[PDB]
From a paper:
The human (Homo sapiens; Hs) methyltransferase (MTase) METTL9 is the first enzyme shown to generate 1-methylhistidine (π-methylhistidine) in proteins. METTL9 preferentially methylates an alternating histidine (HxH) motif, where “x” is a small, uncharged amino acid, and multiple substrates have been identified. METTL9 belongs to the so-called seven β-strand (7BS) MTase family, also referred to as Class I or Rossmann-like MTases. Putative METTL9 orthologues are found in most eukaryotes, and we have here investigated the activity of such enzymes from several species, representing all five eukaryotic supergroups.
Like HsMETTL9, the OtMETTL9 structure is a monomer, adopting the canonical 7BS MTase fold consisting of seven β-strands (β1-β7) that form a twisted sheet of characteristic topology, alternating with six α helices (α1-α6) located on both sides of the β-sheet. The overall structure is very similar to HsMETTL9 with a root-mean square deviation (RMSD) of only 2.1 Å. Like HsMETTL9, OtMETTL9 contains additional structural elements (β′1-β′3, α′1-α′4) outside of the core 7BS fold, which are typically involved in substrate recognition. Among them, the region containing β′2-β′3 has a slightly different orientation in OtMETTL9 than in HsMETTL9 as will be discussed later. We also noticed that the binding surface of OtMETTL9 could instead extend into an adjacent side pocket, where peptide residues located C-terminally of the HxH-motif could bind, creating a bent, C-shaped, binding groove, as opposed to the straight groove of HsMETTL9. For HsMETTL9, access to this side pocket is blocked by strands β′2 and β′3, which are positioned differently from OtMETTL9. Binding of the peptide in the C-shaped groove in OtMETTL9 may impose additional constraints on the identity of the Xc residue, which may explain the more stringent requirement (small residues G or S) for peptide methylation activity of the OtMETTL9 enzyme as compared to HsMETTL9. Most of the residues that are in contact with the X or XN positions in the HsMETTL9 structures are identical and have a similar orientation in the OtMETTL9 structure, such as N88 (Hs N118), R93 (Hs R123), G94 (Hs G124), M96 (Hs M126), R198 (Hs R214), D286 (Hs D300), and Y292 (Hs Y306), whereas S283 has similar properties to the human C297. The only difference is OtMETTL9 L84, corresponding to the human R114, which moves upon peptide binding and interacts with both X and XN.
Residue numbers in the entry: 7 to 305
């Protein structure tokens, strides 16, 4: 009539979909702008549908892909091996999450140019790119860059920098405005890049003045570490005053100041969504705590 109550000491931690945190303590933020500009998102059938992808795939099938992935990544990275096998997909935003934040930033209706930094597979930003008449993407992987040119992206820049992204897009047929893109998404990239300040500065000069929407996602807690190449682990140079542990509210207020706020952005809305990763034969999904900052470019 109910689940089994088995007392163990080595079964790890397991939660359901209702335990996923979507809200936070609003009054526990020293920054005033972070309190009123908070929009609480929630679960939906699209996010739950992503959770059951490992269950509907089969345990024996999730084991075949896992063994083949470790065998493939001897000569490539982890993300490149998952794209070849069609596993390890990432989920952050649902279609309902899109219509909520797009109406909040003013540019709710479709149209304009969109830039996805670090897309690779673009499945995370797939529902978002349906609104813009022009879509661009930047990915340093050659194999994954060719995949983006087949899914609907008009221009796919095969590089890991965004110094002259607004100018290099126009060189490849990207009929984007000379003053920058309209909306740019940098989802879960500050924990991997070396210079997070120089990244936001490059993201700033890539947007239009005044009317310039920026979508930034950072995993909380913020543990920055840069991977050089194969078997070469490094450390970030910019020591941001952000705790490596603690609660979600402390990391947001620490990432707001010191890093995001000194850039001079206008906070449109702040939300808390789970960073869902596709499961396998052991767990249905792996989830991290993610924070979403929607910013407007200064004049």
């Amino acid at each position: 009539t109910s689940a089994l109550r088995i007392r163990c000491a080595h079964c790890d931690a397991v939660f359901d979909e209702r335990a996923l945190p979507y809200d936070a303590d609003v009054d526990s933020l020293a920054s005033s702008a972070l309190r009123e500009k908070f929009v609480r998102l929630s679960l939906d059938s699209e996010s739950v549908e992503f959770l059951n992808r490992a269950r509907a795939r089969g345990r024996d099938e999730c084991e075949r892909l896992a063994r083949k992935c470790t065998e493939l990544r001897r000569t490539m990275s982890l993300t490149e091996a998952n794209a070849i096998l069609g596993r390890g997909k990432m989920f952050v935003f649902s279609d309902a999450h899109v219509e909520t934040l797009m109406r909040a930033c003013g540019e709710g209706a479709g149209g304009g140019w969109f830039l996805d930094v670090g897309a690779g597979e673009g499945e995370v930003t797939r529902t978002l790119a349906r609104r813009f008449a022009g879509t661009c993407a930047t990915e340093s992987s050659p194999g994954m860059a060719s995949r983006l040119r087949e899914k609907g992206f008009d221009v796919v820049l095969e590089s890991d920098t965004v110094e002259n992204v607004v100018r290099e897009t126009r060189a490849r047929g990207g009929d984007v405005s000379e003053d920058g893109f309209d909306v740019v998404a940098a989802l879960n990239l500050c924990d991997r890049v070396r210079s997070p300040r120089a990244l936001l500065r490059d993201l700033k000069r890539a947007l239009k003045a005044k009317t310039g929407i920026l979508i930034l996602a950072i995993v909380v807690p913020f543990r920055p570490f840069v991977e050089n190449a194969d078997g070469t682990r490094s450390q970030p140079d910019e020591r941001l005053d952000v705790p490596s542990a603690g609660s979600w509210e402390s990391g947001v207020d620490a990432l707001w100041t010191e890093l995001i706020a000194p850039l001079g952005f206008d906070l449109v809305t702040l939300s808390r969504v789970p960073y869902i990763s596709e499961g396998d034969h052991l767990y249905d999904a792996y989830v991290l705590d993610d924070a979403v900052f929607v910013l407007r470019a200064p004049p």
